[PDB]
């Protein structure tokens, strides 16, 4: 199916003393494969997946150089933004940045993105045409004008359309044993008696990859959302994901209800019944 490479960058200022805490992480689809933490001892971009350890020292030297330049840019941005918004030096503030590319099943460029937030709110983002910017307020509008002047969009677009996709393709090849493997959910259903009159059916999906999934309850072959509960998809910790959906039913009527499971790792959607 489709694939994505995304990088997430967070910088948090530490008013009392010192440079901001800076954390950078890279993902291919739902797999983290690199990290950088300014508080860590190495001061290097580090591997977080076996297949990226294939990369030689020139890779790590280049990534490390680049991520440190990111770190310093965010340091400067935090100071700029504090001026733009007339805030004091007494408080901690956050800049967040995310960018990357999506490719379709043909592994060719589908979509690119680059967005930036300050204290948890939209600041500036690249538009889907990769040629213009979305500035959320007047502060961001100054950055927009600056970046239009310096033709940032053109160089960013060269990365997102070109270099980013080339890396993704390379990672997808070297990591094929895991990256190109879909893990279908392992499903089962549990039953819980609340009272002599009411019961809970819980439909489980475990060990699946990628994280994207749909669990729905039907009653007599018709969709049901009332009296249902659906937890957020959660990481298992071994690279796979978990989700469940529950419905409350009258005791004795369990067989009316079916759980439906859609996932890329499944040729056809699954149906479960108690």
């Amino acid at each position: 199916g489709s694939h994505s490479m995304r990088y997430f960058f967070t910088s948090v200022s530490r008013p009392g003393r010192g440079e901001p805490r800076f954390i950078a992480v890279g993902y291919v689809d739902d797999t983290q494969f690199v990290r950088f933490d300014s508080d860590a001892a190495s001061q290097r971009m580090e591997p977080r997946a076996p297949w990226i350890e294939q990369e030689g020292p020139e890779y790590w030297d280049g990534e490390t150089r680049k991520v440190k330049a990111h770190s310093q840019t965010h340091r400067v941005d935090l100071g700029t933004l504090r001026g733009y918004y007339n805030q004091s030096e007494a408080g901690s503030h956050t800049v967040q940045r995310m960018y990357g590319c999506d490719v379709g099943s043909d592994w060719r460029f589908l979509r690119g993105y680059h967005q930036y937030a300050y204290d948890g709110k939209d600041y500036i983002a690249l538009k889907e045409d990769l040629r213009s910017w979305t500035a959320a307020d007047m502060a961001a509008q100054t950055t927009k004008h600056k970046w239009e002047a310096a033709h940032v969009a053109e160089q960013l677009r060269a990365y997102l359309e070109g270099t980013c996709v080339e890396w993704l393709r390379r990672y997808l090849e070297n990591g094929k044993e895991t990256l190109q493997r879909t893990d279908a959910p392992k499903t089962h259903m549990t039953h819980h008696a609340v009272s002599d009159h009411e019961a809970t059916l819980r439909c489980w999906a475990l060990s699946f990859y990628p994280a994207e999934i749909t669990l729905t309850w039907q009653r007599d072959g018709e969709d049901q959302t009332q009296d249902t509960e659906l937890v957020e998809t959660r990481p298992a910790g071994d690279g796979t994901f978990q989700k469940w959906v529950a419905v409350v039913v009258p005791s004795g009527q369990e067989q009316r209800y079916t759980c439906h499971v859609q996932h890329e790792g499944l040729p056809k959607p699954l149906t479960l019944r108690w």
């Binding site: 990088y7 990534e63 990111h70 700029t80 500036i124 600056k146 310096a150 160089q155 270099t163």
Partner: peptide, 9 residues
């Protein structure tokens, strides 16, 4: 591989 040319705000 991350972007080689980041710009300040």
């Amino acid at each position: 591989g991350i972007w080689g040319f980041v710009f300040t705000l």
